[PDB]
Amino acid sequence: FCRFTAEGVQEIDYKDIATLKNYITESGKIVPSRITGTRAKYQRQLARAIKRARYLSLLPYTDRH
Amino acid sequence: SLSTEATAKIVSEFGRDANDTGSTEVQVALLTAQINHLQGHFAEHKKDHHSRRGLLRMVSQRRKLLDYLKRKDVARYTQLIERLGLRR
Amino acid sequence: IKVRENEPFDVALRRFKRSCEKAGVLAEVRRREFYEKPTTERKRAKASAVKRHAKKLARENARRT
Amino acid sequence: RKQVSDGVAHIHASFNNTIVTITDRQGNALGWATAGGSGFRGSRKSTPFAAQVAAERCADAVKEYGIKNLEVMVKGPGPGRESTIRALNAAGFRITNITDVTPIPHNGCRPPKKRR
Amino acid sequence: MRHYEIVFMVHPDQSEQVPGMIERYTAAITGAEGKIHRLEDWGRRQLAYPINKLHKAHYVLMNVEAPQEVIDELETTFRFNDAVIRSMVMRTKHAVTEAS
Amino acid sequence: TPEEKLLRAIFGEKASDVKDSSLRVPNGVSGTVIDVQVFTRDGVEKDKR
RNA sequence: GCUUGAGUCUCGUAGAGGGGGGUAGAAUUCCAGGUGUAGCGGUGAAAUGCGUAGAGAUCUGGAGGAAUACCGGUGGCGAAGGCGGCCCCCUGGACGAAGACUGACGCUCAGGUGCGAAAGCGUGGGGAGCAAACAGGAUUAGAUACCCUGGUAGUCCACGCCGUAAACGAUGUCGACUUGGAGGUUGUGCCCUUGAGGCGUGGCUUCCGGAGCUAACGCGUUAAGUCGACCGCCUGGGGAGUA
Numbered sequence: 001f002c003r004f005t006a007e008g009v010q011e012i013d014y015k016d017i018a019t020l021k022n023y024i025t026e027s028g029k030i031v032p033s034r035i036t037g038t039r040a041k042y043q044r045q046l047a048r049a050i051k052r053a054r055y056l057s058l059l060p061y062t063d064r065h
Numbered sequence: 066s067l068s069t070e071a072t073a074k075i076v077s078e079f080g081r082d083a084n085d086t087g088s089t090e091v092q093v094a095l096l097t098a099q100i101n102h103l104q105g106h107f108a109e110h111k112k113d114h115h116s117r118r119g120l121l122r123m124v125s126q127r128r129k130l131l132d133y134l135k136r137k138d139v140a141r142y143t144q145l146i147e148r149l150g151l152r153r
Numbered sequence: 154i155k156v157r158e159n160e161p162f163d164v165a166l167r168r169f170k171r172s173c174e175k176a177g178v179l180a181e182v183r184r185r186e187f188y189e190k191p192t193t194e195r196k197r198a199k200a201s202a203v204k205r206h207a208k209k210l211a212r213e214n215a216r217r218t
Numbered sequence: 219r220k221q222v223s224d225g226v227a228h229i230h231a232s233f234n235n236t237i238v239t240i241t242d243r244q245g246n247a248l249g250w251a252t253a254g255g256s257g258f259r260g261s262r263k264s265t266p267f268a269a270q271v272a273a274e275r276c277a278d279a280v281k282e283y284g285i286k287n288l289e290v291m292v293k294g295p296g297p298g299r300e301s302t303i304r305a306l307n308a309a310g311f312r313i314t315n316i317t318d319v320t321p322i323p324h325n326g327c328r329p330p331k332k333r334r
Numbered sequence: 335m336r337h338y339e340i341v342f343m344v345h346p347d348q349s350e351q352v353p354g355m356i357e358r359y360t361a362a363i364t365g366a367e368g369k370i371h372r373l374e375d376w377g378r379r380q381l382a383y384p385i386n387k388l389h390k391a392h393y394v395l396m397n398v399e400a401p402q403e404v405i406d407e408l409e410t411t412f413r414f415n416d417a418v419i420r421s422m423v424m425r426t427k428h429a430v431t432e433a434s
Numbered sequence: 435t436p437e438e439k440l441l442r443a444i445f446g447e448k449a450s451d452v453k454d455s456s457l458r459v460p461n462g463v464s465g466t467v468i469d470v471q472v473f474t475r476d477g478v479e480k481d482k483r
Numbered sequence: 484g485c486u487u488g489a490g491u492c493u494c495g496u497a498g499a500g501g502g503g504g505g506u507a508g509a510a511u512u513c514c515a516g517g518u519g520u521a522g523c524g525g526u527g528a529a530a531u532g533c534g535u536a537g538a539g540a541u542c543u544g545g546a547g548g549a550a551u552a553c554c555g556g557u558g559g560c561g562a563a564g565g566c567g568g569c570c571c572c573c574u575g576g577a578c579g580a581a582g583a584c585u586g587a588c589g590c591u592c593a594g595g596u597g598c599g600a601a602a603g604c605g606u607g608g609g610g611a612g613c614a615a616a617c618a619g620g621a622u623u624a625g626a627u628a629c630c631c632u633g634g635u636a637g638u639c640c641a642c643g644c645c646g647u648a649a650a651c652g653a654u655g656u657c658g659a660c661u662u663g664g665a666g667g668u669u670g671u672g673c674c675c676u677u678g679a680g681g682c683g684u685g686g687c688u689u690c691c692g693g694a695g696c697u698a699a700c701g702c703g704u705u706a707a708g709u710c711g712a713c714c715g716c717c718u719g720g721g722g723a724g725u726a
Contacts, residue, residue: 001440006679015341015395015433022444027154027173030554036444039679040556040668041497047554051569053382054507055422056341057391060382061508062322063154066574072492086492087584095491106573112502114598115561119575126490133588157315165290165303170318174553178320179295181552182510185331185613191567196557200689207665207690228541234525237540245542247518252540255522293541323509324568325552328612330511383508406571422570437678 005042012046014053021059024050028062067099079149089134090145096127097151127151220248224314225285227276227306231296234263238276238302240285248283251275266301273298273305281310291317335368338405339424340398343391344417346378352417356394359408368400372431385419395433 004012014020023031023046030050033043053059075098077083080091134142146152156169220242228239239250253268256275262268290303290313307313344352353375360370378392385391405423412421442450474480
């Protein structure tokens with residue numbers, strides 16, 4: 001039940017990470033779609049946001065090495 | 066892929082209206098224009114076996130409305146292949 | 154991944170470790186891949202997970218003893 | 219020696235092997251002990267009690283260096299990690315930070331086939 | 335013609351000689367028929383994970399409407415620039431102006 | 435409320451918890467607001483005001 | 484000649500569909516350098532082997548070859564087979580709101596053509612993990628089997644050949660008709676989408692059941708139900724799906 005991918009219209013970009021640091025666990029993992037209740041489609045769309053965040057170094061692959 | 070910028074022009078030339086696209090000389094030239102532009106796809110990389118059934122589809126259907134124009138107006142049939150050139 | 158907590162512990166406490174992933178890497182890297190298991194267990198597994206919910210709705214009807 | 223207070227106890231516990239290893243803050247093994255080097259050859263190599271003796275066999279001659287506040291980075295999720303981490307915390311140390319640094323790749327090559 | 339959300343990071347070393355290249359890149363889009371949607375220079379924001387050598391890179395955003403054959407030459411230049419270490423683009427149709 | 439929670443538990447902070455309970459002109463007045471003097475949060479400054 | 488059949492066009496949608504190339508992170512084997520121990524692997528138990536010519540382990544760096552985590556959903560694409568990171572070039576199939584048209588232009592099919600996982604072979608590269616042939620220690624009355632330490636064809640990529648399967652919800656393909664629900668996945672029209680709702684309309688798929696069928700289990704709008712069209716096949720098993 002969130003106003004992210006239901007009322008928050010038009011794909012959520014990874015530029016504003018003041019919200020994406022809520023979707024990743026403080027390490028680098030992703031929070032399951034059964035935890036933060038969002039429709040599987042947009043959890044893959046947020047999976048596209050987090051993926052490109054891992055490609056442009058905003059949201060890493062993991063915390064440290 | 067048959068660009069829309071070209072489709073509306075073929076229907077503009079061959080078809081007698083902007084939207085009277087359900088006629089013989091339209092659907093044929095349209096699908097023929099698909100092939101004519103599809104050259105770039107089945108020339109390079111070559112190994113598109115799944116895209117082969119897509120070809121199968123549109124080429125055969127084309128030969129189906131020609132399959133009908135033949136039984137109706139042989140004057141326009143030889144004329145259609147004469148303007149655009151879709152026999153060869 | 155990494156837990157600190159300055160000095161109110163007097164214990165190892167692997168809480169955040171097991172809260173992040175910890176074993177989730179070991180379970181997949183110890184033995185051979187076996188190209189078949191994914192198909193198998195993704196399906197079988199979640200099917201049975203759905204049954205618990207189905208159990209919730211079908212166990213409250215009668216039971217009049 | 220080495221003039222260090224911050225040590226790094228790398229613990230690799232796979233199956234029948236549990237190795238406690240206090241190293242320098244870099245990873246310079248200043249001393250270690252195996253549960254299989256402390257005897258217990260066999261099924262006991264897979265027993266946390268041997269693991270706690272290992273924690274001790276590796277907790278000695280380390281304050282000769284000067285380590286008190288130490289890091290315990292484990293790269294071996296075995297049967298201990300209580301029996302031994304709480305053992306160093308029982309030896310008299312204060313583990314500033316208890317770490318679990320599991321290397322995490324997106325699944326790559328293939329490991330051996332086993333147990334079947 | 336086509337929308338490409340070009341986001342790139344250069345070296346904190348080029349943190350001062352890149353705004354001059356900001357003039358270069360977008361002026362080239364002007365010399366290649368194209369409008370920019372949001373010209374931004376935030377600063378040398380701290381990276382997520384260290385990229386081979388140094389942490390904290392200099393981020394700069396463009397998000398520009400230019401031909402694909404032009405951004406193709408452009409990403410080539412980015413990839414072949416000692417400043418830019420990473421530079422990727424998105425797909426067409428959609429565009430932004432907030433980015434915050 | 436049940437159907438609104440979790441948003442203000444993940445998304446942000448002040449994006450919902452706050453509402454609007456303004457003040458209005460008492461019935462019986464028909465004039466023009468003239469002077470306005472306001473003051474802000476000592477020690478930990480308010481917004482742009 | 485006309486349309487409720489097929490199909491095309493206008494405007495859009497999601498993805499392990501495919502082909503060619505490239506990129507990212509990290510890792511097993513091996514090599515070298517700093518430290519250091521006398522043990523390591525493994526099994527029900529034991530052991531060949533390795534090691535003091537300093538292994539296993541730990542930190543950093545590096546060349547090859549191959550594989551895609553959490554997100555993952557009896558979910559998705561397809562004739563079938565089969566197939567999961569991403570991007571770039573190109574393209575197809577499935578489906579839908581509201582309309583304009585050709586006017587049955589449709590379905591299937593022996594010989595035939597094409598697709599055909601995996602594997603074997605001819606050729607140019609190839610070798611980390613593993614593994615036919617083979618060697619060794621043993622449970623044992625024996626071991627050319629289960630275990631373990633090595634290792635060649637192979638596993639990978641491209642061009643051809645054999646044209647083979649549990650190539651199986653075991654149920655051929657196409658159309659029409661016959662009370663529903665919990666679901667999953669992907670669009671849209673209408674109403675105050677004020678909000679993650681309500682009422683209809685299609686594809687795929689699972690389970691519980693009605694009419695019906697069957698030896699029975701059970702299938703059941705994706706039917707093993709009711710009809711029509713087209714195709715292959717059977718007449719007890721073995722012999723043999725073999726010469």
